[PDB]
């Protein structure tokens, strides 16, 4: 049933990014023996939890999925009440609380709201973390958007000397809508994923978390940019290439002179 | 009229013009209008109060230099009319603006209203018999003679990347960002203020422009060069003074690669070129990566193409053929291509005739020009 | 464990959301997955009928070289859509994508004059603004009302360039002679997946009216309303793409912060910015 | 510089002050005998009451028009012969060269400081000037606390008295290790 899995992933690849959760559950309802085989490479939105003791929010994924509970980084507690989970290193717990702090600053600077979370775990010669960012559109506004970001980062620290090897994998799951009069309703799905790795020197002024912050910042700038120009301009190009606004036989004139100049440019070769 | 056509390049900082057929243009003057600051008292002083060309360059100490074209757009049509009249004055053409064909370049993706008002000016004020408008990229590839390629030119007001296929600019993949050499000059002025040598005057701003054009190079290492302590290469002011530039002669041209230094939501020139090629189809990426021409005046920095090659290696796909050509006639590639497109026999049908415009309007030009 | 009757709703859900030009691939990924061709045979057959009746599927007519469209508004049961052009009935295999039985449809006669009239005017319109367009006009005396259901469809299926797109357009030319409230819809679905995944889904609920003055006048006038709304809609869509870096995305994620600078991570981590002080 | 230009105008009045220890008397005159005209030109086309002034020496100086045109320099540095801008243009350019999403918030919060913001009719003229340059129907709000001379010092007293200041300074050891680069590194 391995070909069945390949076609299943391609089906999710071509599936409409509006009902990712429901249709993923449906596809799992086909072959439930292949269920938690798909929940590793099928990108879907996030789940907002609620830290009761702190009064914050924290997102849900597999990295915080300790057993079947979730480690709330604002409290380092598990919900459902599992007092047998895998607590992170106390060292990494302090590094994680400052990580959550720095990314709250990051999130507030670019997203001006939204929910974020940064979990962490070990490595033999380093550590690794995940960065969840979920920005839903302004509910008051008509723009029904939902920015979703997941950043798999793996700090492969070298021997000593404080130089590292920062491996990072990201993912953006966009969502957009406008109920504008000129467009009626213009829905706009979309999703990206990239990888980047750099070896920035670690120091007392340049900790690991700062290097990760620069990488996440650059990565999201590239993804948002890349999206907006390449992919969205590509869609605009497709709509313009399908139907043209200019009347034909006028386009035959401009394309006529265009082919004339094609002959002119390829005439003096 | 059956006479030689006049090719005009509306440079954002340096307007280049002259009759077609000529290879190198013999009439080049900057794009600004200066008015006298001080009050004239003595009789027999200068006459005119509006200086353009070499007169403005000689009397910089009197004129309050202002620009009429910022970021490709025209913000003062009176000044552009005066500069267009100066092109036909007794120092650049010594002819009329109503008895010759006229070729006018423009930056790509410009607003419709600019072409509209330019047509209004060139057809009502000047009674131009033949007027044709074009881009500043098509002409550069025409001058280089290549067929397909990506034009990365940088004027004093814009840096646009245009992938051209067989002599035509694909409108579906033109990239344009409002950043250029003038903004680098302003950024450079800010660093000079951060060094002591502050030049807070427009008549003194061209000295900063000369500093940009003479002692500014791009650094390959964005951090090792940043942490250096250079030899502080001196520069002589136009009076006899000295400026120890130091650590700001390279940070100032870095604006063209990251516009975050000025705080503007855009992308660097290398990223602009990457997106300009990736917006196009797969069928030409291998050829466009091997066909890049660095036109434009602002692309003359010492080490611009080298750092571009390094950044494209960091952004383009796996070890693809990255060929970037550096023509020595970079400053006038667009004008040379203008002479090429103007001296064509087929050119007798692309210009919008005077009667057509006067009886139809600019909409007819938009339905006819390209 | 899930029953078999729910698989029909599942396959229907996967076919009714298949992007244009990618139906066969959804079929392969559902044939090699549902494992019972009988269940998806009946259920998915109805789903195929839906997916091919709603999206104005391009069907080839081998006799007259027209490539007519199958619109939901015309049928006689066993894929017996009534081709208005050439007055021929036809069967069609939704999977094979090949029509069958070009029997010369003995149409009862509803608005055949309007059918080819507004069809002709729309053929001119399609040949004007649509590159690979296709027109089809359904004439019907629906529930005691004469109407024209002019449909427009254009598409580009380029799998080597990893994209698709299918401009679909319907115009219920309600022939309510004193006031033809021509209300239709222009739904668009565009997919692009080169090194990623992007889907554009839109539609404009066009609403316009005109009195049915004459036939040729309202034919070309129907084209006037059509050219108006379509030029308007395509242009407006392009400018929505133009104003997206600073408005829609800024609703989601800004390009640069409000301070227009990068993040001094060394500053935030080294000390608190003064957020404790207000 | 306003005092310097005032010295030039006093010379044009006839009273000469050129000694270095007399330039201070010119500063004293600027501090207690100048004001800002609301209308910059309508008041210039009139003859004021020409109030007197008592020097430390005991003499008497009638100023006249050299009291409102002297601090006019701040709003027009053409009088000194310079292509710079006025104060109002510094505010409007500082606000407009920022994110468009913060302009209203910045126009609703303007704080003055520094001793030159103590002239009579300063804030009122600044409001008029900014209204002429700001876009229509945007609430402009200029605050002017009573400690404009001590604003930066009081702010220093609040900032340095915090526990985060320990991590905000530059230690001597650090300066001996890195050098001036450490200061430019931790300049904020
Ligand atoms: N040696 C140089 N180094 C850096 N910039 C230069 C040099 N020489 C000329 N320039 C730049 O050339 C620019 C002129 O723009 P230009 O390309 O002439 O506009 P256009 O291409 O629209 O005519 C100025 O910004 C100036 O900074």
CB distance from B344 to chain A under 8 Å? yes
Tell me if A265 and B142 make a contact (CB, 8 A cut-off).
yes
Tell me if B279 and A234 make a contact (CB, 8 A cut-off).
yes
Tell me which chain D residues have a C-beta less than 8 angstroms from the C-beta of B227.
181
- CB-nearest to A261 from B145, B167, B367 is B167
Residue with CA nearest ligand 1 atom 12: B297
Superfamily of domain B137-178+267-333: ATPase, nucleotide binding domain (3.30.420.40)
Cα separation, A111 vs A124, in Å, equals 34
Tell me if A242 and C155 make a contact (CB, 8 A cut-off).
yes
Q: Which two tokens stand for residue C12?
A: 């229907």
> What letter does residue C224 receive in the DSSP assignment?
H
Cα separation, D123 vs D141, in Å, equals 10
Q: Which fold has domain B179-266?
A: Actin; Chain A, domain 4 (3.90.640)
Method underlying the structure:
cryo-EM
Q: Which two tokens stand for residue C272?
A: 């608190």
The helix-helix angle for D2-13 and D23-33 (nearest 10°) equals: 100
Ligand 1 pocket member B12 (CB < 6 A): yes
Give a three-class secondary structure readout of chain D.
CHHHHHHHHHHHHCCCCCCCCCHHHHHHHHHHHCECCCCCCCCCCCCCCCCCCECCCCCECCCHHHHCCCHHHHHCCCCCCCCCCCHHHHHHHHHHCCCHHHHHHHHCCEECCCHHHHCECHHHHHHHHHHHHCCCCCCCCEECCCCCCCHHHHHHHHHHCCCCHHHHCCCHHHHHHCCHHHHHHCCC
- Assigned CATH for B1-136+334-368: 3.30.420.40
Nearest of C150, C171, C190 to residue A186 by alpha carbon: C190
> What letter does residue C86 receive in the DSSP assignment?
G
| Test site for ligand 1: of B298, B301, B327, most ligand atoms within 8 A of the Cβ | B298
Superfamily of domain A89-269: F-actin capping protein, beta subunit (3.90.1150.210)
- Residue in chain C lying closest to D161 (CA): C277
| C29 CB neighbour count, 10 Å cutoff | 25
Give a three-class secondary structure readout of A176-217.
ECCCCCCCEEEEECCEEEEEEEECCECCCCCCHHHHHHHHHH
β pairing state of C180-185 and B324-325: unpaired
Contact B149, B164 (CB under 8 A): yes
Cα separation, D103 vs D164, in Å, equals 30
β pairing state of A126-136 and A146-156: antiparallel
Contact D50, D63 (CB under 8 A): yes
- CB-nearest to C258 from D102, D158, D164 is D102
Backbone φ and ψ for D134, nearest 5 degrees, come out as -80, 160
Q: Does domain C1-107 have CATH number 3.40.50.170?
A: no
Give a three-class secondary structure readout of chain B.
CCCCCEEEECCCCEEEEEECCCCCCCEEEECCEEEECCCCCCCCCCCCCCECCHHHHHCCCCEEEECCEECCEECCHHHHHHHHHHHCCCCCCCCCCCCCEEEEEECCCCCHHHHHHHHHHHHHHCCCCEEEEEECCHHHHHHHCCCCEEEEEECCCCEEEEEEECCEECHHHCEEECCCHHHHHHHHHHHHHCCCCCCCCHHHHHHHHHHHCCCCECCCCCCCCCCCCCCCCEEECCCCCEEECCCCCCCCHHHHCCCCCCCCCCCCHHHHHHHHHHCCCHHHHHHHHCCEEECCHHHCCECHHHHHHHHHHHHCCCCCCCCEECCCCHHHHHHHHHHHHHCCCHHHHCCEEHHHHHHHCHHHHHCCCC
* Residue range(s) of every CATH 3.30.420.40 domain in chain B: 1-136+334-368, 137-178+267-333
Q: Which two tokens stand for residue B278?
A: 């990736």
- Assigned CATH for D1-84: 3.90.640.10
For residue C191, the cross-strand partners are C199
Ligand 1 pocket member B190 (CB < 6 A): no
Q: Which two tokens stand for residue B156?
A: 């004093």
Q: Which two tokens stand for residue C193?
A: 């997946």
Residue with CA nearest ligand 1 atom 26: B298
- CB-nearest to B260 from C245, C246, C262 is C262
Which helix H or strand E contains C181, and what residues bound it? Answer: strand C180-185
Architecture label for domain A1-88: Up-down Bundle (1.20)
Cα separation, B23 vs B336, in Å, equals 6
DSSP string, C47-69: HHHHHHHHTTEE---TTTT---E
- Assigned CATH for C108-252: 3.90.1150.210
Cα separation, B308 vs B306, in Å, equals 5
Nearest of C264, D99, D98, B314 to residue A217 by alpha carbon: C264
Question: What residue segments make up the domains of chain C, in order of their start?
Answer: 1-107, 108-252
Q: Does domain D85-151 have CATH number 3.30.420.40?
A: yes
Residue with CA nearest ligand 1 atom 8: B213
CB distance from B230 to chain D under 8 Å? no
| B60 CB neighbour count, 10 Å cutoff | 18
Tell me if C128 and A247 make a contact (CB, 8 A cut-off).
yes
**C-alpha torsion sign, points A135, A136, A140, A141:** positive
Question: What residue segments make up the domains of chain A, in order of their start?
Answer: 1-88, 89-269
> In chain C, positions 27-46, which contact chain A (CB-CB < 8 Å)?
28-30, 32-34
Cα separation, D56 vs D28, in Å, equals 10
Cα separation, D167 vs C272, in Å, equals 9
β pairing state of D142-143 and D110-111: parallel
CA–CA distances in Å: residue D130 to residues A220, B67, B367, D36, D49: 39, 25, 45, 15, 29
Tell me which chain D residues have a C-beta less than 8 angstroms from the C-beta of C261.
none
């Amino acid at each position: 049933s391995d070909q069945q899995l390949d076609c299943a992933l391609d089906l999710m690849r071509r599936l409409p990014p509006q009902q990712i959760e429901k249709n993923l559950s449906d596809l799992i309802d086909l072959v439930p023996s292949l269920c938690e085989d798909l929940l590793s490479s099928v990108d879907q939105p996030l789940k907002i939890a609620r830290d009761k003791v702190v009064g914050k929010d924290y997102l849900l994924c597999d990295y915080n999925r300790d057993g079947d509970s979730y480690r709330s980084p604002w409290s380092n507690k598990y919900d459902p009440p599992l007092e047998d989970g895998a607590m992170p290193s106390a060292r990494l717990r302090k590094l994680e609380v400052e990580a959550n702090n720095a990314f709250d600053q990051y999130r507030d600077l670019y997203f001006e709201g939204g929910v974020s979370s940064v979990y962490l775990w070990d490595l033999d010669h380093g550590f690794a973390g995940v960065i969840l960012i979920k920005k839903a559109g302004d509910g008051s506004k008509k723009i029904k958007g939902c920015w979703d970001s997941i950043h798999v980062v793996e700090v492969q620290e070298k021997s000593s000397g404080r130089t590292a090897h920062y491996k990072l994998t990201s993912t953006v799951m966009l969502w957009l809508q406008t109920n504008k009069s000129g467009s009626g309703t213009m829905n706009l799905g979309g999703s990206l994923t990239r990888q980047m790795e750099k070896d920035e020197t670690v120091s007392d002024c340049s900790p690991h978390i700062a290097n990760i912050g620069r990488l996440v910042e650059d990565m999201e700038n590239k993804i948002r940019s890349t999206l907006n120009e390449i992919y969205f301009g590509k869609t605009k190009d497709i709509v313009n290439g399908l139907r043209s606004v200019q009347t034909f036989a006028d386009k035959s004139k401009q394309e006529a002179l265009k082919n004339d100049l094609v002959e002119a440019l390829k005439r003096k070769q | 009229i059956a006479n030689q056509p006049v090719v005009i390049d509306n440079g954002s900082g340096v307007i280049k013009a002259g009759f077609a057929g000529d290879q190198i243009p013999k009439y080049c003057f900057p794009n600004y209008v200066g008015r006298p600051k001080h009050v004239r008292v003595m009789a027999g002083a200068l006459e005119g109060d509006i200086f353009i060309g070499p007169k403005a360059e000689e009397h910089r100490g009197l004129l309050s230099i202002r620009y009429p074209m910022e970021h490709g757009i025209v913000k003062d049509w009176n000044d552009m009319e005066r500069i267009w009249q100066y092109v036909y004055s007794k120092d650049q053409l010594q002819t009329f603006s109503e008895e010759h064909p006229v070729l006018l370049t423009e930056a790509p993706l410009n607003p419709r209203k600019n072409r509209e008002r330019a047509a209004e000016v060139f057809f009502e004020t000047f009674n131009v018999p033949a007027l044709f408008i074009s881009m500043q990229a098509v002409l550069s590839l025409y001058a280089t003679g290549r067929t397909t390629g990506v034009v990365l030119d940088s004027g004093d007001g814009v840096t646009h990347a245009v992938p051209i296929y067989e002599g035509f600019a694909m409108p579906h993949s033109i990239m344009r960002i409002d950043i250029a050499g003038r903004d680098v000059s302003r950024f450079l002025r800010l660093y000079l203020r951060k060094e002591g040598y502050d030049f807070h005057s427009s008549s003194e701003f061209e000295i900063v422009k000369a500093i940009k054009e003479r002692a500014c190079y791009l650094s390959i290492n964005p951090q090792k060069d940043e942490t250096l302590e250079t030899e502080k290469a001196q520069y002589y002011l136009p009076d006899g003074s000295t400026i120890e530039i130091g650590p700001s002669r390279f940070r100032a041209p870095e604006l063209l690669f990251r516009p975050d230094l000025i705080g503007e939501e855009s992308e660097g020139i290398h990223e602009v070129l990457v997106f300009a090629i990736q917006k196009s189809d797969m069928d030409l990426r291998r050829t466009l990566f091997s066909n890049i021409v660095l036109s434009g005046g602002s692309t003359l920095f010492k080490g611009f193409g080298d750092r571009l090659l390094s950044e494209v290696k960091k952004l383009a796909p796996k070890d693809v053929k990255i060929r970037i050509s550096a023509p020595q006639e970079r400053l006038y590639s667009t004008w040379i291509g203008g002479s090429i497109l103007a001296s064509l026999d087929t050119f007798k049908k692309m210009w919008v005739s005077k009667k057509e415009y006067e009886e139809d309007g600019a909409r007819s030009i938009h339905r006819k020009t390209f | 464990r899930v029953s078999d009757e729910e698989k029909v709703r599942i396959a229907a859900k996967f076919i009714t959301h298949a992007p244009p030009g990618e139906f066969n691939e959804v079929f392969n990924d559902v044939r090699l997955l549902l494992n019972n061709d009988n269940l998806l045979r009946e259920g998915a057959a109805h789903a195929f009928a839906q997916y091919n009746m709603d999206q104005f599927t391009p069907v080839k007519i081998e006799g007259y070289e027209d490539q007519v469209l199958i619109t939901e508004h015309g049928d006689l049961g066993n894929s017996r859509f009534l081709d208005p052009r050439n007055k021929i009935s036809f069967k069609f295999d939704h999977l094979r994508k090949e029509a069958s039985d070009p029997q010369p449809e003995e149409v009862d006669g509803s608005l055949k004059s309007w059918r080819e009239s507004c069809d002709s005017a729309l053929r001119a319109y399609v040949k004007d603004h649509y590159s690979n367009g296709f027109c089809t006009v359904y004439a019907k005396n629906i529930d005691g009302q004469q109407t024209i259901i002019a449909c427009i469809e254009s598409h580009q299926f380029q799998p080597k360039n990893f994209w698709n797109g299918r401009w679909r357009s319907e115009w219920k030319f309600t022939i309510t002679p004193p006031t033809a409230q021509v209300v239709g819809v222009l739904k668009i679905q565009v997919h692009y997946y080169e090194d990623g995944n992007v889907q554009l889904v839109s539609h404009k609920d066009v609403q316009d009216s005109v009195t049915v003055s004459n036939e040729a006048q309202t034919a070309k006038e129907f084209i006037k309303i059509i050219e108006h709304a379509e030029n308007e809609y395509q242009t407006a869509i392009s400018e929505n793409y133009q104003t997206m870096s600073d408005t829609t995305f800024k609703a989601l994620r800004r390009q640069l912060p409000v301070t227009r600078t990068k993040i001094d991570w060394n500053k935030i981590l080294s000390y608190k910015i003064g957020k404790e002080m207000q």
